[PDB]
Amino acid sequence: MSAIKTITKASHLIDMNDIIREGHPTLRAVAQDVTFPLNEDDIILGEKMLQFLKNSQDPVTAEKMELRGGVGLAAPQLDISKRIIAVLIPNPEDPPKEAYALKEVMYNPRIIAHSVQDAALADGEGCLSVDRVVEGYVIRHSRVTIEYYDKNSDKKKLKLKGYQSIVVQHEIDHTNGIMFFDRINEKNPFEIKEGLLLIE
Numbered sequence: 001m002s003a004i005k006t007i008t009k010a011s012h013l014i015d016m017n018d019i020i021r022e023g024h025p026t027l028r029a030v031a032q033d034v035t036f037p038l039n040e041d042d043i044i045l046g047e048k049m050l051q052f053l054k055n056s057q058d059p060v061t062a063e064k065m066e067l068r069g070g071v072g073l074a075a076p077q078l079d080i081s082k083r084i085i086a087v088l089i090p091n092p093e094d095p096p097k098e099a100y101a102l103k104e105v106m107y108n109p110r111i112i113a114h115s116v117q118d119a120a121l122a123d124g125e126g127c128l129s130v131d132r133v134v135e136g137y138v139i140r141h142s143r144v145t146i147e148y149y150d151k152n153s154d155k156k157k158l159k160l161k162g163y164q165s166i167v168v169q170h171e172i173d174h175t176n177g178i179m180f181f182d183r184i185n186e187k188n189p190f191e192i193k194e195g196l197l198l199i200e
């Protein structure tokens with residue numbers, strides 16, 4: 001059976017062996033739109049992705065399952081070429097009353113509006129699919145508005161800034177065959193063009 005019929009089995013927990021790595025053709029393919037109302041595979045696929053991000057963020061399940069920690073994940077990294085992403089972003093400590101800043105599976109997500117202003121994480125970016133070091137500022141839009149459908153096949157619109165905007169952009173890129181290192185300037189990886197906001 002397919003990566004999707006396999007991952008959606010009730011017994012299946014997503015781990016690192018389900019995540020394909022830089023070099024695999026499916027990471028460079030343009031993902032397929034999902035059709036609505038959502039089939040149950042697409043629905044379970046999303047719950048599994050969010051459960052993987054929980055697992056990967058919990059010290060005890062992570063070390064035991066041998067997971068590398070994450071806050072976003074996209075179906076193409078599971079060798080399922082569909083426009084599906086999961087984001088699971090914890091609220092900052094200073095330990096929060098509400099666990100997560102953003103927790104969402106997005107179907108056919110796309111940027112319909114973005115700020116002129118660019119931004120990048122100061123510490124660069126990483127990817128579960130990238131098993132090497134790639135240093136440099138990954139240049140993104142500071143703010144974005146996304147159109148997407150939720151698990152209820154309901155059309156949503158959401159405005160994002162800072163850290164969550166970066167994450168969502170990262171994951172949407174996967175659905176378009178684009179890897180973070182594509183947005184690093186190879187000439188000077190730590191070049192700051194005027195205007196660039198760094199997220200420290």
Ligand SMILES: [Fe+3]
Nearest residue numbers: 126127128129
């Ligand atoms: Fe990634």
